[PDB]
């Protein structure tokens, strides 16, 4: 008989180079020598937050007592963006939990124990340097503008909801970073745009997608759900009506197969119903600490897209 | 036989008044009575950070159980900028470690012990109020523009590297604070501008000045050097190339005879070579605490100016 | 959405420009002075927020 013990894996690959086609962090895993630097049995502490907004998802990691060779490989490439993937689970499988580029790295080795630090960004390089220069005339179909701008961003299309037969009412011009322009189109058309684990997600506010996840005491829930406001401020109201404005909170054992834009079903004894996801935070302490995930849910009032 | 014990001195002088010539904090030390208020044998905690950037270097200080007369002298002059100097060393000498103006001061005396607080700025008054209004035509030598703007700033010239026979390509106009205009000229010409302990330093990025300091176990080093990135973010690269982009970290016993723009030689058993300095932080606890200095080094790839 | 530290500054800057930083705008003349030529301008543009509130430029 065994116990139920945690497991994880961390991989470091070649520098990421942006080209003239969508970037996939998967293909950069292999190093010039072939197999990548894998780190399994070392105490690790990490925190990974995810959201549906302009900003990329960022995660922090700490590793104790790394071998000198690995640290040397990171002393080099300090000018470059190494690709990194993280996996976690329970002794039988490990689900992808983050993938991005090493934004920052530093080492402090006071006496007894060295402590390496990381800051990782989910597509930070693309979202902050992809320039654009486009224009359109009166009568252009809005569905064409959306596709044109996304292709400029150079990322795979996770999911998109086209506008239909919508047409521009006035001439438009777009410059600067493509991400910023798209985030502005979100406000005026009730659409949510956010990149996550390399995938572009374009959806409509208020509406939600089946029960892709069910939460219950069998599903490793942790404590009862509690109602928490989804924003730190309140807006004036007429009392688009379809927009968000309500939510709840839940916690569960670590499970990387969840994304901010997904949908979940809450099977508890007090609260029951369907909710959207709005925010994720993954925490982990291998030898000591939690191994759980926190979800911020938001009520929905739109159509079932 | 003795031990190796710490010593320090703190001096407070007359209010600083800016005039029509370079400001020297040295000449304001003497008070109307003559000798200044010197504080030697009182537990003191201080933190002084220094850098090479637009912002002035600021340091914090705390003193316990001050006499009522001294506190009274600071209750007055609360509208004025008193000049302050700080010294530290080891029982045989004390090197100047900071000099500036008292930006802030507050007193809290709950029951047993009063605790005075200070915030000091290195040339804050000059850098934030020196206005300018200048213009030049096509063909003007850039070396003339630089000297004209610095004289406006009203500070002694610590060190400057002239541009040679460079000439303006387009007409230029400058207004507002002189410091801001100079900091903009830095970006477009690969030059570093930063005031420190009253001295103006204008140098060129990438290049460095002899071994003015050597670090080794004999030189009171504290722990091994570790590689740390010199910035909290990574820039996109073509992979001016001469710019910085790499660095290291070291710690040493308190030594005020060091400046951000200097050069140091690192004689350790793993790392060996020459580095620039980029950042300093001086910490100190007289009765209890550290008495060390931390240096952030940056690799260089330019000519040996 | 509103969790990141950068989004807060983004919204704050966006709102700050709304009440200041006026550069150019179209308008229509409503009052004309022929001695020392000057004109009174009524800006035409406006916006309506989702909260049923409107922003009108005053006569200049």
């Amino acid at each position: 008989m065994r116990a139920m013990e945690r497991t994880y894996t961390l991989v470091i690959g070649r520098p990421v180079v942006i080209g003239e086609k969508p970037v996939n962090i998967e293909k950069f895993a292999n190093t010039s020598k072939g197999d990548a630097y894998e780190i399994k049995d070392l105490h690790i502490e990490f925190n990974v937050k995810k959201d549906n907004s302009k900003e990329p998802n960022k995660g922090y990691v700490t590793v104790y007592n790394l071998s000198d060779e690995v640290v040397n490989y990171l002393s080099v490439n300090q000018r470059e963006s190494l690709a990194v993937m993280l996996h976690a689970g329970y002794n039988g499988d490990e689900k992808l939990i983050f993938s991005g580029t090493v934004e920052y790295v530093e080492d402090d080795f006071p006496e007894e124990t060295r402590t390496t630090k990381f800051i990782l960004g989910d597509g930070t390089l693309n979202l902050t340097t992809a320039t654009t220069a486009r224009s359109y005339r009166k009568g252009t179909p809005v569905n064409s503008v959306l596709n044109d701008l996304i292709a400029d961003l150079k990322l795979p299309k996770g999911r998109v909801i086209d506008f239909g037969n919508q047409t521009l009412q006035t001439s438009m011009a777009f410059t600067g970073n493509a991400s910023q322009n798209l985030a502005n189109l979100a406000k005026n058309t009730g659409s949510t745009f956010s990149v996550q684990d390399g995938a572009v997600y374009w959806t409509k506010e208020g509406s939600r997608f089946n029960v892709m996840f069910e939460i219950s005491e069998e599903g490793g829930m942790v404590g009862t759900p509690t109602p928490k406001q989804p924003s730190s401020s309140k807006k004036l109201i007429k009392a688009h009506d379809i927009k968000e404005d309500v939510g709840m909170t839940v916690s569960t054992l670590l499970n990387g197969a969840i994304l901010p834009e997904s949908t979940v079903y809450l099977n508890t004894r007090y609260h029951k119903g369907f909710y959207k996801v709005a925010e994720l935070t993954h925490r982990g302490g291998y030898e000591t600490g939690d191994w759980i995930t926190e979800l911020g849910l938001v009520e929905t009032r739109g159509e079932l897209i | 036989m003795r031990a190796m014990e710490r010593t320090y001195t703190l001096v407070i002088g007359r209010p600083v008044v800016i005039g029509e010539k370079p400001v020297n904090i040295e000449k304001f030390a003497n008070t109307s009575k003559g000798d200044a208020y010197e504080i030697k044998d009182l537990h003191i905690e201080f933190n002084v950070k220094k850098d090479n950037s637009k912002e002035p270097n600021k340091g914090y200080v705390t003193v316990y159980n001050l006499s009522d007369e001294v506190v009274n002298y600071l209750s007055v002059n609360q509208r004025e900028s008193l000049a302050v100097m700080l010294h530290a060393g080891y029982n045989g000498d004390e090197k100047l470690i900071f000099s500036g103006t008292v930006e802030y001061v507050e007193d809290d005396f709950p029951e047993e012990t009063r605790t005075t607080k200070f915030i000091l700025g290195d040339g804050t008054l000059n850098l934030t109020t020196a206005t300018t209004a200048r213009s030049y035509r096509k063909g003007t030598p850039v070396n003339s523009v630089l000297n004209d703007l610095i004289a406006d700033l009203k500070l002694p010239k610590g060190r400057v590297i002239d541009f040679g026979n460079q000439t303006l390509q387009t007409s230029m106009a400058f207004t507002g604070n002189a410091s801001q205009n100079l900091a903009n000229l830095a970006k477009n010409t690969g030059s570093t501008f930063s005031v420190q302990d009253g001295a103006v330093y204008w140098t060129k990025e990438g290049s460095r000045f002899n071994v003015m300091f050597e670090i080794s176990e004999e030189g009171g080093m504290v722990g091994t050097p570790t590689p740390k990135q010199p910035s909290s973010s990574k820039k996109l690269i073509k992979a001016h190339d001469i710019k910085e982009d790499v660095g290291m970290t070291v710690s040493t016993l308190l030594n005020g005879a060091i400046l951000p723009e200097s050069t140091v030689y690192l004689n350790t058993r793993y790392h060996k070579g020459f580095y620039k300095v980029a950042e300093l932080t001086h910490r100190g606890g007289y009765e209890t605490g550290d008495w060390i200095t931390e240096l952030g080094l940056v690799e260089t790839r330019g000519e040996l100016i | 959405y509103a969790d990141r530290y950068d989004a807060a500054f983004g919204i704050y800057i966006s709102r700050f420009l709304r009440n200041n930083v006026h550069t150019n705008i179209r308008g229509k003349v409503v009052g004309v002075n022929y001695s020392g030529p000057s004109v009174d301008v009524q800006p035409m543009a406006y916006t309506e927020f989702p909260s049923g509130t409107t922003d009108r430029y005053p006569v200049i």
Binding site: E55, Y104, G121, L125 | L236 | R4, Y5
Partner: peptide, 26 residues
């Protein structure tokens, strides 16, 4: 003990600086 607290405050400041300054060609 203030040593422990200063470290956490420093790390939070570092995270905020990273959030403000990231990516970009300049």
């Amino acid at each position: 003990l203030r040593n422990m607290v200063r470290a956490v405050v420093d790390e939070n400041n570092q995270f905020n600086f990273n959030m403000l300054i990231q990516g970009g060609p300049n």
